[PDB]
Amino acid sequence: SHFIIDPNRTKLITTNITNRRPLPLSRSNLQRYYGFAETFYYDLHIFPYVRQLVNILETSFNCSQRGITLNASVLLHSTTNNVGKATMVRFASKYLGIHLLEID
Amino acid sequence: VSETWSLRAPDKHARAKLLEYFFSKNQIMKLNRDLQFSDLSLETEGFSPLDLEIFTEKIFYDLQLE
Ligand SMILES: Nc1ncnc2c1ncn2[C@@H]1O[C@H](COP(=O)(O)OP(=O)(O)OP(=O)(O)O)[C@@H](O)[C@H]1O
């Protein structure tokens, strides 16, 4: 079942791409382990807006898994810049272990 | 154009029927016995059918939260 790979003896071939869900932040903090710019960890109990928005993604994800399709979309707006709405988007994405598709 | 036709905002009875059907579409929904569609329409005046769509989906989500 197991095996060893040696560059001088073992050959490797890249193949087509395969989907796989990313780990939720609960099981590990990849940024912290790799020492990247760790994204600020919200305490949902103290950030009600973040909680409300999160209360969307997992429900959509479950209903999809439960065979229920529903186009869940949401738009962030604010009265002042520099509030990290994108930061909270990333935080929510990592929280549920969901792939992120950011387009500036 | 000889004559024309205009789609004014839906009426309360229209709203009762439309809300019932929209709930039906996501048949997974259910409602309390006391809550009746006719009663429901009385407080949803001046809403476009798409508005009722989004409102029912929002309600479905709200139920999912709890
Ligand atoms: N609690 C926090 N909320 C928001 N941003 C935070 C927080 N803690 C740190 N930051 C940092 O602040 C920055 C937020 O920038 P971001 O682009 O997400 O803001 P924004 O609200 O979308 O604003 P704008 O589009 O007006 O620049 C990031 O560099 C992020 O790391």
From Swiss-Prot, chain A:
<protein>
    <recommendedName>
        <fullName>Peroxisomal ATPase PEX6</fullName>
    </recommendedName>
</protein>
<comment type="similarity">
    <text>Belongs to the AAA ATPase family.</text>
</comment>
<comment type="subunit">
    <text>Interacts with PEX1; forming the PEX1-PEX6 AAA ATPase complex, which is composed of a heterohexamer formed by a trimer of PEX1-PEX6 dimers. Interacts with PEX15; anchors PEX1-PEX6 heterooligomers to the peroxisomal membrane and mediates their association with the peroxisomal importomer. Interacts with UBP15.</text>
</comment>
<comment type="function">
    <text>Component of the PEX1-PEX6 AAA ATPase complex, a protein dislocase complex that mediates the ATP-dependent extraction of the PEX5 receptor from peroxisomal membranes, an essential step for PEX5 recycling. Specifically recognizes PEX5 monoubiquitinated at 'Cys-6', and pulls it out of the peroxisome lumen through the PEX2-PEX10-PEX12 retrotranslocation channel. Extraction by the PEX1-PEX6 AAA ATPase complex is accompanied by unfolding of the TPR repeats and release of bound cargo from PEX5.</text>
</comment>
Curated annotation (Swiss-Prot), chain B:
<comment type="subunit">
    <text>Interacts with PEX6; forming the PEX1-PEX6 AAA ATPase complex, which is composed of a heterohexamer formed by a trimer of PEX1-PEX6 dimers. The PEX1-PEX6 heterooligomers associate with the peroxisomal importomer via interaction of PEX6 with the peroxisomal membrane anchor PEX15.</text>
</comment>
<protein>
    <recommendedName>
        <fullName>Peroxisomal ATPase PEX1</fullName>
    </recommendedName>
</protein>
<comment type="similarity">
    <text>Belongs to the AAA ATPase family.</text>
</comment>
<comment type="function">
    <text>Component of the PEX1-PEX6 AAA ATPase complex, a protein dislocase complex that mediates the ATP-dependent extraction of the PEX5 receptor from peroxisomal membranes, an essential step for PEX5 recycling. Specifically recognizes PEX5 monoubiquitinated at 'Cys-6', and pulls it out of the peroxisome lumen through the PEX2-PEX10-PEX12 retrotranslocation channel. Extraction by the PEX1-PEX6 AAA ATPase complex is accompanied by unfolding of the TPR repeats and release of bound cargo from PEX5.</text>
</comment>
